[PDB]
Ligand SMILES: CCCN(CCC)S(=O)(=O)c1ccc(C(=O)O)cc1
């Protein structure tokens with residue numbers, strides 16, 4: 001069928017190398033946006049601005065947001081004095097998100113993930129109607145414009161609104177980056193394309209660490225990260241629309257003109273000449289010839305409820321650990337580098353294990369170790385720095401490996417008639433976990449160590465539900 005035409009037109013040739021590289025390139029800045037709150041919203045040490053004046057906690061530091069009424073307690077009313085030695089200006093220092101507004105920092109991150117969740121749902125449907133190239137162009141422009149306006153937001157509600165729209169646009173690019181590349185690649189390569197995207201996203205953690213080290217101002221950093229998406233919109237007009245979508249849309253005239261252009265780039269002009277309407281109609285016989293069944297059929301229910309738990313738990317604990325970089329005693333400019341560095345060997349071990357033993361034993365190992373490492377982190381006293389840092393790095397490594405393991409597992413358990421819906425609805429649960437993770441982080445005011453326990457007790461429970469899945473090997 002269609003797979004033969006791509007092989008006939010040149011397979012993986014010059015066009016595929018140019019297009020896939022250009023489409024996947026913006027994924028470097030994807031990790032620089034989700035994690036950006038660690039650098040544009042860091043909390044420097046703040047002691048209350050005097051009108052001797054500042055009571056001290058039993059540790060010894062000046063108490064946060066309590067000052068003596070008369071010189072040697074009353075809450076701050078003249079503002080705060082921040083530490084300008086390592087963080088010049090973050091959104092916490094710009095709008096006093098310190099004591100009565102601790103949750104306002106986490107709420108802004110939660111509102112961003114609502115954009116990511118809403119972006120995939122809306123722009124996923126919009127892609128199937130206006131194409132994959134047109135939606136990608138509109139997402140490149142929206143990400144650049146909405147990201148830029150956040151760097152100039154005069155009010156906190158304006159900052160949240162212009163970051164929610166950035167999250168809405170940044171889900172469309174990630175979703176369409178996979179679709180526009182997979183559809184132009186042969187079927188047997190589809191497994192490799194998903195791996196490349198994850199590794200490309202992995203290198204994005206390094207880029208954020210490098211940029212945030214040289215441009216610490218939050219207004220400059222937010223603008224600088226969203227600046228390149230203007231250049232990703234200028235060259236987005238030269239993409240070649242996915243020919244598979246054109247054939248499915250019923251416009252077989254377009255899919256002949258799309259394939260011939262690929263033949264010219266790939267150099268197989270003569271084989272491109274043989275293409276015509278009549279051969280296209282005959283070859284594309286099975287191409288032109290629903291989530292409701294995912295909740296109705298009994299045998300498919302057991303997969304959806306189970307698989308939604310692994311997707312949710314893996315992402316819920318991933319963003320409950322990535323966003324905590326300041327409680328380790330090491331500079332965040334180094335922990336972020338280490339966090340992205342452990343991503344690669346952990347994924348390689350994950351790929352090595354599944355091919356060696358299976359998928360179910362790999363899934364239990366990936367999550368339970370992450371749940372144990374996170375849980376042990378909370379009990380271990382903060383005095384230990386190397387011990388606590390090692391556990392968190394090891395925990396984030398497993399959760400990175402769990403993402404690859406659960407992505408391949410979803411693509412092999414769901415039947416081919418449902419996979420597109422099952423994978424699409426599977427990743428939606430992942431974005432739901434990213435929303436709830438900051439909200440769970442907001443309860444640290446009720447109990448200092450509660451968020452770590454919830455971030456650890458969830459993957460442990462998920463490791464106790466992955467035993468209800470048929471392993472796929474051979
Ligand atoms: C199903 C999407 C998962 N995501 C969460 C969306 C809010 S993601 O941010 O795009 C991501 C994170 C990490 C890795 C990895 O390292 O394996 C891959 C993808």
Ligand SMILES: [Cl-]
Nearest residue numbers: 120171174431
């Ligand atoms: Cl996503």
